[PDB]
Structure formats: structure tokens, C-alpha cells
Design a protein around this ligand. Sequence first.
Ligand SMILES: Nc1nc2c(ncn2[C@@H]2O[C@H](COP(=O)(O)OP(=O)(O)O)[C@@H](O)[C@H]2O)c(=O)[nH]1
Ligand SMILES: [Mg+2]
Lengths: 190, 583, 65, 239, 67
Amino acid sequence: MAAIRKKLVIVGDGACGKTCLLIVFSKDQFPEVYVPTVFENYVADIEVDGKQVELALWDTAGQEDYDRLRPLSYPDTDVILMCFSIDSPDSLENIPEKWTPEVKHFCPNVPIILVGNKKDLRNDEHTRRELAKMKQEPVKPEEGRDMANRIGAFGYMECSAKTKDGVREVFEMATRAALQARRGKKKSGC
Amino acid sequence: NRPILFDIVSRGSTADLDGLLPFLLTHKKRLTDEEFREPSTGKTCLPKALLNLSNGRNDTIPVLLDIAERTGNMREFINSPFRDIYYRGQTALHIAIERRCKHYVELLVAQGADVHAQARGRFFQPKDEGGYFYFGELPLSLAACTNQPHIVNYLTENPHKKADMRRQDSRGNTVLHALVAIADNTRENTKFVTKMYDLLLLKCARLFPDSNLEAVLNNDGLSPLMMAAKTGKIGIFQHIIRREVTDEDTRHLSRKFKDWAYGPVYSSLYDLSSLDTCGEEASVLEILVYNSKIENRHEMLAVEPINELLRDKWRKFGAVSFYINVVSYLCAMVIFTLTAYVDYLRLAGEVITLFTGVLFFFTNIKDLFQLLYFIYSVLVIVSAALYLAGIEAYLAVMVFALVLGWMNALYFTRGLKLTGTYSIMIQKILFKDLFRFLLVYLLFMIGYASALVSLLNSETFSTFLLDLFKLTIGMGDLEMLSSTKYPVVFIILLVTYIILTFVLLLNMLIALMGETVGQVSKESKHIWKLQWATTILDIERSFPVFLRKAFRSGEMVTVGKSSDGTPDRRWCFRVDEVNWSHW
Amino acid sequence: LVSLLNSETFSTFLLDLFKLTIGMGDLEMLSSTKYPVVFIILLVTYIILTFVLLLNMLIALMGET
Amino acid sequence: LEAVLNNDGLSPLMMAAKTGKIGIFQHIIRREVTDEDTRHLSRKFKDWAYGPVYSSLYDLSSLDTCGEEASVLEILVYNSKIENRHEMLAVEPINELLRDKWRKFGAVSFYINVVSYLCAMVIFTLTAYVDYLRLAGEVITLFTGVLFFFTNIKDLFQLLYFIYSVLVIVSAALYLAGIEAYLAVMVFALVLGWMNALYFTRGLKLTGTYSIMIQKILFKDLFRFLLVYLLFMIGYASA
Amino acid sequence: VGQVSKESKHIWKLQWATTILDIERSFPVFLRKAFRSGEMVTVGKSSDGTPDRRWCFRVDEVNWSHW
Ligand SMILES: Nc1nc2c(ncn2[C@@H]2O[C@H](COP(=O)(O)OP(=O)(O)O)[C@@H](O)[C@H]2O)c(=O)[nH]1
Ligand SMILES: [Mg+2]
């Protein structure tokens, strides 16, 4: 009928594929030469269950000077994709430490989907050898499942921008979660 | 540098922009980059260009658009929003519409500018929320609000990307809701708003035959008519209620039809959809007199189909069933009066007394000056516990409650037309003037009692106070005076104190008639209808759905064959009016 | 008032209460009362209510009538 | 030129306000001039507009409180003696200034001033009546009366309040003396205090009209009627 | 009261105004400076060049008539 506008924002450590994940979702064409630091001011049309939804995709980076302006993208946020890299274990442990409190502080009572990107690289020989150099291993799916339950994640999936694997379903669940209007209020004042 | 570009854009000189594209391509900079944008609000070059215009003409805009297309950031360039809370969400198209530049609006539309962009900054909220101007946060609604019909026509008829009229903002308001919001009671505003409303409704009808725009509701769950009734915008509500449209294709959208005429007498049907009691959806009449909080509420009842509906209701319940509700309280008063007083029958009636008080409390809790009635219900309770106990103080509680009941009889007088004004006047005096006067007088009396005690030179004060009340009556003798160290000063004071208490109370009567009753005298007739209306509504609310369905006013009429073919059957209430003028 | 005092017993009270409205009569009832403490406030309150409602009548008469 | 003052020390705007010439004062307050060279001479500027809503600045130079120079608003309602005073408050920037002030003090701080007199009334009421604490409060009673008188002398129907302050004084001398007539003085003053409560009612919006009406009746009609009635009663007593 | 009845609303504002003024008079210069109404605005560049900065009190008015 009449498309409903929902705001989606992606927050994660750098080089975990947030911009690429949105880009593959937008044009379904992997950019092999040029990747902007941020993908902004785009709205995508998606239908999940009899409803047509225009999803406005915001993107947050923190390489240089974007961290100062990051907070003002949080207001009026409908759904969040907290992203990290499967081929980089360092990303996982910082989510509970730093990413979560900022998200809760600026925009609480918002759905959150914890996702791990680039499932292909966990089996890659080069990445496996590099992690083994430090007696490390790629982020196991069990750890991601435990983390999702640990921090109240709405859902946990895995993406692969190079192979375009699971992107449609991931954002499909993202908007499905967004369409839920929370549950009233808790401990509301009189 | 950024200030130089801003100044160039401010002047409007296209020549000064020469060489900009080579600079940007050499530096690989974008017009949407942070450096070029103003840090305070994120403002870009194009908004600055739009805000400055020479006789409504700025030559930089096409060059800016051309270079933005050359660099390949046109989408980001035109969709870049402001991030300041004060001006959050504003885009170039909002400025273009606000500045009444048709050609620039068309250009921006042609260049892929977002047309459903929201502007939810604090400056765009209603007055209550601290904002200045509210229009619905959509370009289409913004054009509709500022009396720009050509822009609405273009936005809805453009080939590149049309703007759905059904679109809803964060609040859920549609264009019609915003139109109702910005309307006021001034004549010109109501006229322009009505014309815009009708044009919008007809356009939506043509574009969307199956749907009905007015049916759409906001997050709060208000239709445009209901919101117009609630907020007190009289003119648009009156126009929405008496909408008549000649066009055959859109005939079903209008409300007041005309069935037949026989000369100077005409009988026109009206539409009671969403305007009558015993309906699952909220009733416009009910919300108009329950949570209106509107200073023009009294004038909202003067509308043709509104006023008469109450008289038609009056026949069914008003004039025939007020007796029963009155009588119920009379019977309860008798049952209670039996308290002080066939031992078995008397005990049964005594149980009935507590049962009647409990029933009054049970219906009181369900209904929630009914706080006075609540006090009565509260007082009933303690008596049962103390009666089981055998304590001797339950009589005091019963005394308070009994007097409260006989006083409540006044509320029953208020309902009747004959006593409707007198009861309300007594209550108003008891609340506005009498209450404050008594409050002040009590403290004054206590202080003067202390003064009299000092002149006499707790129990010694209690005797004086009781005998002083007797002195006000005059039955009691002046026992205090005899036992006074300094009566000479007291004698003048005692008379003076009585004068002051009485004269201030005498002034209250003068104050009440003019200061308090001055506005009551003028609006008593309007208030009486409101009082009558509230009483009528409560009667219908009590009755269950079956009982309400028994007396749904009006007669079902098939107005005409609908698009589906099954005639539209609104529940219509005929109105008879004769007029010699015209034919 | 009869209940507070705790037909003829009501007749005496009524006649003497009319005298009380005049003020010539003494408060014979009060002496013979089980609970005068509650009655004392009420008796004054009752007189106020009777008079103030009648005082309002004069205000009502000039403008409403 | 408007800066220039006369011997009395009045600017044209201030004199216009004092003497009651409404039209020129309204025109001086809302002066707007298009000429660029003389732009600084006008008062009401227009900052921005967004369609049907406009927001225009105004100039409060020589028109606001807490200024060393005399305030036009203050002189308009202190020593105006103008029969058109009520219409002078209707001017746009004048009327609204009071509501903006009302938020800061009007609706939030009237309670405190009211309460101060309530507390003083209680302290005085303790007079008739932990011996050491009671004596300390008794000293506080005289101190409160003296404080009321001290603020009364600074402020100068405040002549009624002056009478209250006057009556407080005699009590100390007679209390040291041990004379028995100080009670009469205290009686007069105590009733005066509870009556002064009416002045506190006047400030509140709800009782603002009733208090003033009571005072006016007590002064215009009631005073003269009582004055005549006293003499008539004395003569009839002689008869 | 005939003249009082008509002008009571005007008198009440005068009564309210006098009471408001006394409150501000009592407070010392620092306390008064705390709540100087309006917002300082640089109206425009003056002849000297330093913008004229009157203490201005914004007034909001809407009007459909005209443009
Ligand atoms: N091989 C491979 N590389 C990827 C994939 N997704 C992302 N990358 C790499 O990740 C790098 C940075 O990712 P980016 O989009 O900038 O993530 P962001 O910094 O959080 O925005 C890119 O240069 C890509 O080469 C993938 O699916 N396969
Ligand atoms: Mg990036």
C-alpha cells in the first residue's frame, strides 16, 4: 500500500565490511576499485510480509573526524546492525566493552542484530595462518551465538559481500525486527 | 575556501564560480564533504543558494547542479540533510517550497531530489513542544499548508517520482491532518484551508478510487474530522461535516445529501458515520464534550446536524428517563434514612442500607464534582467494621454521609431544565467565591480568637471559642466579657470583629454576582446545554450494546449505487428546513 | 439531629429547632444528646446551608429570573 | 538626538510615557526605518520568517529593570498619574515583557513572600503564650516586628502596615517597665496582622479582584458611611 | 463598583505589575543581572564597525494576511 519509512544504522569497528555490506545490498555489485568511507543518503525498497518498507540506510565510520559527528546519526533510529569481522577476533571482545554502552546511552530500547561478516575468510589459508601466528583462530559460530544471547541481540546471522551470501535475508530480518513497535513502556511514571 | 564559496553563492554571481569544477576534480573533493559543509548544522552550498534570491532568481543553482552531476555525488548533494536539532532533517526541497520558487521545485524534482524526506527538528514541532511552525514534515504537506496549489499539482503529477498523498510522518499524521493542524478560526484561513482540503480530497479520490484518505488514522488514532473537533478548529470541522460535491464520480465522498423537496420545504439527509453513540469507534460528539478542552466548545454545538441530534436523543431518553435516575437516589436516600431507626424486616432493610452505600461506591469506582460523591462512598465503608466492633463512633461517620446524600440531591436538580441554572450557580459560588472566602475567614477567626484570649488574660480558649460562636448566633450570653482583664479595648474590638467578618462576607455576594456570575450569566444557556449534553451521554454509556442499538437515531438510507454496485448505506439522520428565498 | 440525640421526641426537637432559627429558644436539645460533639459542627453547618442556599436565591432571582 | 536630556533628566520616550501621550510613545517604541544609513536609529528589527510565522526583535534599551537609568516601564506605573495608563500596557513589547518576567518571578516566587508573612504571623501568635526556647521565640517576636518596621521605613495602603510597625514599638518599653497595658497594643497589632493577610491575597490572581474590591468598599463607601453613622449614633444616644 | 467592574481586569494587571516590580527592586544588582530578560543580539554592523549590541527581547507573531 503506502510505503513505511524505517531508519537503519550500522555501527562497528573499521574494516569489518559495514560500508561494503550496505553497498552490495544497494546495487548488488561489488566495488572492486573504489569504496567510499561511508555510504549515506540512500533509501531501499523491501517487502517481507505483505508490507512495503523504505529502509533509510545510515553508515557510521570512525577513522578521522567522523567519531565526533557519529552521535547525531543515532536519533530517531529504528533498527541497528551491530557488525564485526569473523576473520578478525579482536572485533568481538570490543563489542560488549565499548560499542554496546554508546548504543544504549544514545538510543535505548532499540532492536539490535549482531552479525559477523565475510564467512569466506574464516576458511581462507592466509587468514588462518595469520591468526595461528598468534595462537588464535577465526571467530567460531558458537562464540557469536553465545554473544548474541549475552547482549540481548535480536538475531545473529553471517554475511559475505564478495559472494552476496545471506545479505537479503539479513536485512529482511532487520526490517522485520524494525517493524515491531517495542512493548509499551517499563516502570513508567505516574 | 568554504567562506568564499558561501559568499559567492550569496551574491548569485555565476562568473565567480568559474574554475570550481577543475579545483574539485584536482583535489577529489565533493560538495557534500565536511569541509564545505558548515559544522554547526551541516549546511551545504545549495541551501545557502536557495535562501538568497534576487527577484526570485538565482543563477548559481544550475551550475551547482551541473558540477554535482559531473563529480558523481548528485544524490548525496541533493539529499544531504541538516543535523542540528533546531533544523534537523531539512533538505533543499523544503527551502525551495518555502521560498515559492515553482521552477526550482520542478528542477529539484527532476534532479532526483528525495520527495518523502522528513524534517523532524525541534523547530518544526507544534507550539506545545517548543516549535514554531508545524506542517507535517513532508514536502507535499508543506506545499499544501503554505497555500501553493501549483506545487501540489506538480508534486502529485510529476513523471519522475510522485508523492503519495497517503504518506504518514513519525506522528502518523497525513496531509489532511496537517491541514487541520495549521488551520485557525479566522475567515480567510478557513476559506483557503477548505479549498485546499477539497482539492486534495478530490485528487486522492481520482488517484486512489479504492481507498479513502479520511479513513486513514495517525498513531494516536484520530481522523481529520475527530482531530478538528478535539482541537477546536471550528471552520474546517463545520465544512467537513456539511461537505457537498456535485461531481458524480466523487459523490460518495460528500456527507449531506438532499432527498426531496416539495416547494419551500426541503429535507436533507446527513451522515452519522463516526458521529453517533453506541459505536465501537470513538464518537465525534462524545470527544467534543468529554476531553475537548476547547474555548470554542459552545459554538461547536451550533452546527446543524450536531444540535438537532441531541433533541432527537432528548425524545428517547432526555425527557422520559431522567425521572428514573432521579428516583433511584431518592429511594437510596430513604433506605439510608431508615438507619437511625417487624424486627426481621427492619434488619433486612438495615442490611439493604449498607448494600445501597456499597452499590453507590461500586458504580462510583466504575465511573472513574463526583469526588464529593466519592467522599460519600468512602465514608460508607468504616461503618461496617465499627458496627461489627460495637464501637460508638460509627454514628459520626453516618452523620457526615447522610448530610452528603441530601446535599447530593442538588446534583439531581441540576439535570432538570428548570433547576439547571440555579444548581450550577450554587455550585460555582460554593467553589469559586464561597470556598476562598470561607478559607480566609476561618484563619481570620482563629487569629481574632487568640486576640480575645489575650485580652481576657487551650481550655480557656475552647470556652471562649464556643461561646463566641453562640455570640454570633446571639443566643449565648457574654460570659467571656465578664472575665476580662481589659474589656474596654475588647468591647470595640468585638463589635469591630463581627463587622469585619460580616462585611467581608457581604462583599462576597456583591463579588459573586458580577465578578463570578458575570460570565456565568452570559454563558448559562450554553453551559446548560453542555450540562444537559453530558447527562444525556452518561445515560447512553450505561446501557449495553443491545439497549443502545434499540434506539440508534436516524434511519438507514441507501444514498446511491456505489462503485461496487451495492448501494452505500450510511446511517442517516434527516433534517427538515424550509426557506422561501431561492427556488 | 434526632439520630445524634439518641415521634414526640422528634416533635420537641423540631419546634425547639425553629425557635433556635429565631434564636429566642434555648438549646434544650443539645443537652440531651448522645453525641453533641459531632452535632455542634453540624447544627451550625445546617443553618449555614439553609441560609446560604436562600441567600443564593436572591442572587438567582435578580439575574436569572 | 534622543539621547539628549532636559534639566529634569527625561528623554523624549520617557516623558511621553510619563505625561500619557500614547500615540507618540507607541510610534517611538515601534519605529522602523528602511534607510540603511539611519538603520541604527530604529528599534524593532525583524530577524527571520518561515512563512506565516514571523519573529521580530525589539529594543529594551531604557525599557527594562535592573538598569542604572530610569526605566520607562517603571515610571509608567510608579509616578505616571495618567488617565490613559491602562492603555499604555497594551503595546506589543510592553505587555509581553511582563509575561516573560512572570515566568521568572511572578508564578514561582509569590509563594515565598506570602509565606514570610505567614511565618511572622505564627511567631507573633506565640506571644500570648522549654522555657529557654519559648523566651528565645519571644525575643524573635519583637525581632520580627522590628524587621517589618525596618523594611517599612526602607520602602517609604502601606500606611496601615506602618501603623502595625508603629504599634510594635511601645511593647518593649512597657514590658521592661512591667506595666499592664502592653496587651492592648499587642491586640491592635495582632488583628492588624491577620488583616494584612488580605494584601497577600491581593497578589494572587484568584483573589486579586476580591481583595481590591473589599479594600475599595472599605475606603470609598464603608469609610464615609461609618464616619456618618458614628455621629448619628452618638446624637441618638443623647436623645 | 460600577467603574471597578469594568476596569477590574486592567486594574488587576496594574496590581500584578506593581507587585512584580517590587520583587525585582528588592534583589541586588547581581540577582537582577541573573534574570535580565531577552537575549543579547548584534543587530548589525555599526558605523564604527563593532556591531551594535542592544539587549533585545524577541516577539513571535504569525499573520496569514500578506506575504
Ligand atoms: N575478499 C573479501 N573482502 C571483503 C569482503 N567484504 C569486505 N571486504 C574488504 O574489507 C575492506 C573494507 O571494508 P569496509 O566496507 O570499508 O568496512 P567499513 O570500514 O566498516 O566500512 C574492503 O577493502 C574489502 O576488500 C568480502 O566479502 N570478501
Ligand atoms: Mg567505510
